[PDB]
């Protein structure tokens, strides 16, 4: 544990050993960011799972009740005589040692926290064979590189200067490691160079016994090469850690010595009474301190209580067994169900001791135990009411299935505690109510594999973060009778169902998870955490990253978060607050009533005990929520139906409304930097305020085309910022007035070059109906005198007096028309109009008309003026109705009279051009007679 912190952080070496930060088990292409900003690529291997390494580092699990270490630590060493993994304590019963310094320990219980490093390296391989079998690519070469972790006395080295932390040895929190080069493989001891390159961490006193791991090509599996014997220092600063090789036979002899085979092939019933095993092919009068290894299937009968000492119960074939015995009890190392064995457990485990379950098989518990389970592997069926008082699930490999009504216990957690990497609780058709789920990370899964639906109620009484997952066939419910402050439910793990979540009088946040890192000391305080912090105050000062050395598992200001994917059918909101914070990917529909929805909440939540929530012996839960500003990108995708609600989409948030949005008396706001795309239609009764980006498009089908979509606002689109952007394109029919005090942008239609096609789903009748042959229909007035509008391939049904700063119309029709109760003529007022290949269709009753007024600049070629004659003109009256008004220098050919009729008139307009001293104008000064509408067809006249 002598760490060169010249170009790396102390926490990097800790994260490495502890599978925290970037060093997740199995991860490839890991890059350590140096203090100088550049990157160090790890060797090309799936990163090792270091869970076999004991809390103190000097001992390592090799599976079951066995661990390996260094003989010269001694039988009595505090890290050998007692050995810990997670919240569990294990006592050494004895050990077997082989020269030079290799020790294998027999423990008193089956270790549930880890499968262990079950296999060793083949030390009989030659140099070259070993390089081929165990070599890994590093800086473009195959090298015999090994990985390891330990917690010998800590010191740090910066550019030569060593700073020791003499008290700091065997500190679980300080577990640290490195990848190292094996300089000597075939020699008497394996010799590793821990400073062969850059990530340099030399072994120090207390690292003795810690394991060396190498990666097997063929087995695709990390295996143990040896245990730390000692350390050599040579002239000119060279250094090796020396390793006592894995000795398979020392292991096998100890294992066999602590095993006793019981052959029940055909031999009816195994009976155990006061330490005597009868009725089998392997009868004896003890049988104590030995794993009983059962084969052949069948019944085990206790005629007395059975304390097997350090020995456990092992089942070693894919057969079924039954353990019966009055009200007698078992005590020992636990139950190891191997090779798919099924054990129907119909006795009680000792009431003052924890049952340890490992093995890939099944423990089917048929009666109430009145004691605790610790499980790490395979299946446990809870077949009785209150099967266990408490359950501790660790490592990720274990599953607990409810198979009875009322199967869990009471209290805040229902007696379920998910420790490191958790495991799966299968509700299996039964409903459960938790006040809180005591889970420490995202490895905790609550699910339901039954075809019968189950309901998971969460009733947390104060603020609380659930780190786990909710999967499978379950609905989620959080209902309170009154809405109170200070009991928010925060999900920062995940949800993955096709079912519903129901919220009533409550507050819910969905959120990503701040990645957990190693810390120096768990708890407050002379002070080594302060000293270590001061060693890197220079680096922190330079890189502005105080979170990195603050002795906190995570921090609101850190950049590394894990996305929370929340997939569900419908989220039902009744008088509730729903928030999506940073780094979420929410995928589902929302139905909201009297509710507040916030997408892009700047408040995020972190748990200062994340990853270390499970306390004591495994059956307590701690959590310390910190909250504050922490912005980051986030996503919602789906539909929303909202009544009497408010919706806010905030900065960095992207909302893809891929289903219908229905806003009934709901206040909707899209803020600066927020991005909303709606593609499956909308209805709104109230104003939508847009300071960011609202894009309204048709529905993209499977074949690169668009089904028309309708955007119906009975109120107004309010553009509330200079930076606002309202976009409609790709087969969208929009209805509703636009108002803006600001210099926002409006963009209707696809880009001139970039055409889009109709879905084969859509009949041509419907298409003409909603779009008039154009890409976009817009119906409403626009009063945004400072705003810019761009319209291409657009049908503007202009239904009221309108005002823009600048307007550009290419291949569009501005169609002046009426509504329910207008029936008045309208005026389009613009500072600058650039118009080409477009049509303007004005109505007239032969004295007034719709009118276009361009105040400052009118440019563009090839536009027609259509006139809807609402009354049949006669040859008597002198017509002289101003249709368009523009500045003097405008070219008269910008507009021409159409030779087509529009409306119910058989009459074509005659338009004449005039120059007053300040404005040129187009006036209707005559007419000509000709003896679901496709309005795009009109534009043929102007190509």
From Swiss-Prot:
Q: Where does it localize? A: Secreted; Cell surface
Give start and end of each Peptidase S6 domain.
Answer: 2-256
**Cystine pairs:** none
Q: Which domain of life is it from?
A: Bacteria
Catalytic residues per the record? Answer: 72 (charge relay system), 101 (charge relay system), 208 (charge relay system)
Q: What is this protein called?
A: Secreted autotransporter protein EspP
Organism per entry? Escherichia coli O157:H7
């Amino acid at each position: 544990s002598q760490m060169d912190i010249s170009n790396f952080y102390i926490r990097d070496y800790m994260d490495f050993a502890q599978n925290k930060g970037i060093f997740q088990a199995g991860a490839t292409n890991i890059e350590i960011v140096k203090k100088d900003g550049s990157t160090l690529k790890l060797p090309e291997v799936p990163f090792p799972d270091f869970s076999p390494v004991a809390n103190k580092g000097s001992t390592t699990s090799i599976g079951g009740a066995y661990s390996i270490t260094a003989t010269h630590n001694t039988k009595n060493h505090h890290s050998v005589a007692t050995q810990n993994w997670g919240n569990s304590t294990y006592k050494q019963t004895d050990w077997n040692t082989s020269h030079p310094d290799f020790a294998v320990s027999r423990l008193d219980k089956f270790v549930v926290e880890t499968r262990g490093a079950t296999e060793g390296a083949d030390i009989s391989l030659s140099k070259q064979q070993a390089l081929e079998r165990y070599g890994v690519n590093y800086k473009g070469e195959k090298k015999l590189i090994a990985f390891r972790a330990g917690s010998g006395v800590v010191s740090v080295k910066k550019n030569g200067r060593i700073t020791p932390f003499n008290e700091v040895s065997y500190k679980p929190e300080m577990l640290n490691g490195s990848f190292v080069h094996i300089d000597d493989w075939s020699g008497w001891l394996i010799l590793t160079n821990n400073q062969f390159d850059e990530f340099n961490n030399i072994a120090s006193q207390g690292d003795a016994g810690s394991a060396l791991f190498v990666y097997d090509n063929q087995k695709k599996k990390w295996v143990v090469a040896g245990t730390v014997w000692g350390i050599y220092n040579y002239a000119n600063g060279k250094n090796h850690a020396a390793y006592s090789k894995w000795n398979q036979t020392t292991i096998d002899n100890l294992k066999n010595k602590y095993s006793y085979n019981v052959d029940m092939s055909g031999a009816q019933v195994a009976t155990i009474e006061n330490g005597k095993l009868t009725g089998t092919g392997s009868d004896t009068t003890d049988i104590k301190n030995k794993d009983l290894i059962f084969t052949g299937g069948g019944d085990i009968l206790l005629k007395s209580s059975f304390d097997n000492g350090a020995g456990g119960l092992v089942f070693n074939d894919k057969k079924t067994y039954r353990v019966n015995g009055d009200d007698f009890t078992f005590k020992g190392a636990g139950v190891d169900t191997r090779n798919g064995s099924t054990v129907e457990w119909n006795i009680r485990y000792d009431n003052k001791d924890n049952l340890h379950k490992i093995g890939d098989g099944t423990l089917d518990v048929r009666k109430t135990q009145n004691t605790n389970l610790k499980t790490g592997e395979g299946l446990v069926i809870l077949g009785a009411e209150k099967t266990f008082n408490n359950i501790y699930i660790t490592s990720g490999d274990g599953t607990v299935r409810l198979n009875a009504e009322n199967a869990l216990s009471g209290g805040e957690y229902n007696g379920i505690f998910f420790a490191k990497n958790g495991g799966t609780l299968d509700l299996n058709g039964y409903n459960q109510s938790f006040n809180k789920i005591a889970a420490t990370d995202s490895g905790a899964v609550i699910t339901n594999t039954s075809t019968k639906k189950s309901i998971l109620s969460l009733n947390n009484t104060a603020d609380y973060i659930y780190h786990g997952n909710i999967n499978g066939n379950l609905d989620v419910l959080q209902h309170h009778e009154t809405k109170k402050e200070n009991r928010r439910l925060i999900l920062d793990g995940g949800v993955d169902t096709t079912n519903d979540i129901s919220l009533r009088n409550t507050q819910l946040s969905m959120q990503g998870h701040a990645t957990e890192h190693a810390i120096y000391r768990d708890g407050a305080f002379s002070d080594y955490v302060a000293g270590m912090q001061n060693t890197e105050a220079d680096a922190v000062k330079q890189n502005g990253n105080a979170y990195k050395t603050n002795n906190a598992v995570s921090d609101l200001s850190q950049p590394d978060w894990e996305t929370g994917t929340f997939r569900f059918g419908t989220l039902h909101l009744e008088n509730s607050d729903f928030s999506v914070g940073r780094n979420a990917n929410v995928i589902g529909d929302i139905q909201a009533s009297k509710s507040n929805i916030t997408i892009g909440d700047t408040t995020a939540y972190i748990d200062l005990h994340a990853g270390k929530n499970i306390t004591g012996d495994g059956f307590g839960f701690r959590q310390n929520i910190v909250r504050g500003n922490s912005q980051g990108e986030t996503l919602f995708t789906g539909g929303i139906t909202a009544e009497d609600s408010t919706i806010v989409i905030k900065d960095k948030a992207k909302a893809l409304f891929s289903n219908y949005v229905y806003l009934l008396n709901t206040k909707a706001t899209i803020e600066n930097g927020a991005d909303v795309t709606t593609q499956s239609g909308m209805f709104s009764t109230s104003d939508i305020s847009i300071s960011g980006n609202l894009s309204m498009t048709g529905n993209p089908d499977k074949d690169n085309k668009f089904e028309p979509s309708i955007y119906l606002n009975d109120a107004s689109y309010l553009l509330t910022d200079d930076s606002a952007r309202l976009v409609a394109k790709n087969k969208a029919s929009v209805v509703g007035d636009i108002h803006s005090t600001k210099s926002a942008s409006i963009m209707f239609g696809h880009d001139e070059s970039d055409l889009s096609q109709l879905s084969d789903r859509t009949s041509k009748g419907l298409a003409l109906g909603l779009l008039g042959g154009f890409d976009v229909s817009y119906r409403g007035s626009v009063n945004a005198p400072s705003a810019s509008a761009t319209m291409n391939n657009t049908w503007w049904q202009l239904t009221g007096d309108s005002a823009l700063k600048t307007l550009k119309s290419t291949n569009s029709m501005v169609y002046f028309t009426d509504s329910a109760n207008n029936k008045k003529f309208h005026t389009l007022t613009v500072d600058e109009l650039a118009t080409s290949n477009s049509a303007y269709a004005m109505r007239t009753n032969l004295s007034e008309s719709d009118k276009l007024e361009v105040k400052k600049h009118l440019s563009g070629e090839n536009n027609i003026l259509l006139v809807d004659f609402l009354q049949k003109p006669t040859p008597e009256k002198q017509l002289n109705i101003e249709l368009v008004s523009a500045p003097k220098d405008t070219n008269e050919n910008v507009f021409k009279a159409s030779k087509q009729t529009i409306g119910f008139s058989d009459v074509t307009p005659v338009i004449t051009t005039r120059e007053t001293d300040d404005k040129i104008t187009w006036s209707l000064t005559g007419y000509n007679t000709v003896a679901s509408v496709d309005y795009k067809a009109f534009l043929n006249e102007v190509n």
